With several copies, the nearest count.
Chain A
Amino acid sequence: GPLLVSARRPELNQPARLTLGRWERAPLASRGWKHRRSRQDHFSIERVQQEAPALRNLSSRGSFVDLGLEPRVLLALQEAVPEVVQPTSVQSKTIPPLLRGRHLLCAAETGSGKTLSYLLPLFQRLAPRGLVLVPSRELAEQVQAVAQSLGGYLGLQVIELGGGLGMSRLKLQLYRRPAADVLVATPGALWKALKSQLISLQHLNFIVLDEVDTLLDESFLELVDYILEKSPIAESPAELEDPFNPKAQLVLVGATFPEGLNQLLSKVTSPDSLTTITSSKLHCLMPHVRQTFMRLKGADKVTELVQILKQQDKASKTEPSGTVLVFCNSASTVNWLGYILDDHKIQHLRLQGQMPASMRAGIFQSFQKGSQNILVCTDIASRGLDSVHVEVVINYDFPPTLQDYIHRAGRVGRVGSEVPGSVISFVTHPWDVSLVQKIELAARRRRSLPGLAS
């Protein structure tokens, strides 16, 4: 049968029909990955699905009308976003309760339609009318652009507010633009505006939290608390629809949820009033995406990295190929590797968190514009980055945690992906052998990775 796991050493190759189970320790291709003397021992997980899982079974999910969406909204949706002909599983389950004003918590993978899951009820339900909190500035640009595009069809104004921006420059943008019904802001900048009292949340009717796990980061945890005291929150859907006593509807969207979030939600609303929806593929390995694991030293990584680039160069020379995303853990390696790429006369982009905010915004848009097909970026780009046309994700530096890998993984195999996504990760020395062992073991058992519970 077709190999579920393919390795450089064939004796350990697995067929399409074998499951070992929890008690049995699988003989992984990374089980014995210790001594560098056996160079280049690799293994790739092949693509098992030819249809996109999000697009697959769309006919088996109820129509938008069944979700309570008005036909008038559908007509605007068809003009604004004709691409979404049918709702995904997350969209089907999430939209109906939101239109009813019930507080909703959505746990689903990237590219599953989470953004549209709440935006559609958000617009129909509707001194800002809606609030969107996003951890990274890059996500703010994407959400604001998506929200603005929908707003333009509905005659609504949307603006973006990025954290780390100067208070006097922050005010300049606000005064140069008309008042926005819905505001997309980062915790750092939004906290600055609230401290200066540039905006009032008493009239806020809708609050959106994206990447709650990232939003709950200690860098933004205190800022969120300051927002909460100034934010009136609805306790029941009845109060939400009460014109005499209007309150804010809370919606939560994330891929993972740290333990204790219920206590934070309990003090704001009853635990039984929280509607929790979990994606069937949440914390599950992606079969439709190819994952490549190569044994490379830091010196040898450059050799294989360029060899992979030559393969992509050869692939482009034969047929059109999608963009390649290169992930590096540290900026110093990006600059150090970037000079090597510059030495090779290779057009590439360099992105890291500490770059100037204005410079980063232009480069991010330029990559979206397709200015350069090769992008080297750090973990700041693993969140809120558009990767529809990205064919290969190259983790030059192995991701430190599974969650980062999932965020990097979500970039490939998104809805509307023009090219089949692939994932490549490099292990310099036996530093993260356990991480590779867990991934391979889960694939053989076809189980979720341990410790991913939300």
Chain B
Amino acid sequence: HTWEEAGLRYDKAFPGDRRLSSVMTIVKSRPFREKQGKILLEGRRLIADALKAGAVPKAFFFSRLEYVKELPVDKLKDVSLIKVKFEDIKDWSDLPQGIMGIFAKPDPVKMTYPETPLHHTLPLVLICDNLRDPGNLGTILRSAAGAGCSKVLLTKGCVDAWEPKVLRAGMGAHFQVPIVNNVEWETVPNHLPPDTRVYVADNHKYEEDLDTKTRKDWLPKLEVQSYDLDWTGAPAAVVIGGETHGVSLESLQLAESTGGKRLLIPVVPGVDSLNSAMAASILLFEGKRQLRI
């Protein structure tokens, strides 16, 4: 039953509707998300977060009409409002309390982040090195979101930030921090602001990025800088050892060449490389303290 009432339109799932089928292909497969430029949001709160952030949506699938009435329909311009089976929601979502929201793949550089972090937004970049855990990625973005990092870079092999599970892990952190994905190491220096010193927390699988002949003799003897020392005096960049690969070779070379050092957090045994959530969180904040002081 599709209803047109008092200027409010909301559709119902149709028999044989191909629209629903495309959702799971878009939702579950990131390459299709890039091919189509779409993403999925889970939960009213995260859905409401996108509406407040002014993210451009694509479609909303909801079990209950009450959610549409609960939601501001005025902000639902770009979404086809469709009533769907609760079985369809589970069929089309591996996780949604009667609401599903498909959104256009946002461009974080174009995303609307208002003043409050911008007052504390610095030319600081958080870099996750081969972060292969979707749960860490989304929750990691909180630290850059809360700290106010100008832009975030993910090295090759990192999980897709726009994946709904990562969106679930961050619970809206993607709408709070600018993110750049699949950043190539060759382009990282361009991604760094001018005069940026790269400081790397050092914890290894980066030895697998080395020629076998020179594999064992290519370990950089980079100076160990305690992370509690002042590093924010000039533009700076933060590198995070991934839970899987840790700090890559390129990060170690870049830090020495960029005039920086190792933002070494002594990694506690039992966690071979400090959890990217923990490594990311520590470095970003007190940089705000050092600059504020």
Contact = CB atoms under 8 A, between A and B. Distances in A.
Contacts of A303: 18, 21-22, 25
A340 B91 contact: no
Given A306-B24, A310-B91, A343 B18 contact: no
Contacts of A344: 24, 28, 94
Contact of A343 (B22, B29, B91): B29
DSSP class of B's interface residues: helix, strand, loop or mixed?
helix
A303 B20 CA distance: 10
B25 A302 contact: yes
Interface in B234-263: none
A334 to B, nearest CB: 16
A301 B30 CA distance: 18
A368 B227 CA distance: 56
A307 B21 CA distance: 8
A307 B22 CA distance: 11
A37 interface: no
A345 B28 CA distance: 8
Interface string B1-36: 000000000000000001001101100111000000
Interface string A352-396: 000000000000000000000000000000000000000000000
B229 to A, nearest CB: 44
A345 B95 CA distance: 10
Given A310-B91, A345-B94, A340 B18 contact: no
A307 B94 CA distance: 15
A64 B251 CA distance: 77
B28 to A, nearest CB: 4
A54 to B, nearest CB: 36
A340 B21 contact: no
Contacts, number: 22
B29 A306 contact: no
Nearest to B30: A343
A302 B23 CA distance: 12
Contact of A340 (B22, B28, B94): B28
Contacts of B29: 339-340, 343
A15 B24 CA distance: 39
Contacts of A302: 25
Contacts of A345: 28, 94
A306 B94 contact: no
A307 B25 CA distance: 12
Nearest to A306: B24
A141 B117 CA distance: 54
Contacts of A339: 29
Contacts of A340: 25, 28-29
A325 B271 CA distance: 42
Contacts of B22: 303
Contacts of B91: 310
A28 to B, nearest CB: 24
Interface string A239-253: 000000000000000
A366 to B, nearest CB: 15
Contacts of B24: 306, 344
B5 to A, nearest CB: 22
Contacts of B94: 344-345
Nearest to A309: B91
A306 B28 CA distance: 12
Interface in A266-313: 302-303, 306-307, 310
A339 B18 CA distance: 22
A202 B165 CA distance: 66
A310 B18 CA distance: 14
Nearest to A317: B87
A340 B22 CA distance: 13
A340 B29 CA distance: 6
Contacts of B25: 302-303, 306, 340
Contacts of A343: 28-30
Contacts of B21: 303, 306-307
A344 B30 CA distance: 11
A344 B25 CA distance: 8
A349 B276 CA distance: 32
A306 B18 CA distance: 12
A291 B288 CA distance: 67
Contacts of B18: 303
Contacts of A306: 21, 24-25
Interface of B: 18, 21-22, 24-25, 28-30, 91, 94
11 contacts: A303-B18, A303-B21, A303-B22, A303-B25, A306-B21, A306-B24, A343-B29, A343-B30, A344-B24, A344-B28, A344-B94
Given A340-B28, A345-B28, 19 more contacts: A303-B18, A303-B21, A303-B22, A303-B25, A306-B21, A306-B24, A306-B25, A307-B21, A310-B91, A339-B29, A340-B25, A340-B29, A343-B28, A343-B29, A343-B30, A344-B24, A344-B28, A344-B94, A345-B94
9 tightest Cβ-Cβ pairs between the two chains A and B: A343-B28, A303-B21, A343-B29, A345-B94, A344-B28, A340-B29, A302-B25, A310-B91, A306-B24
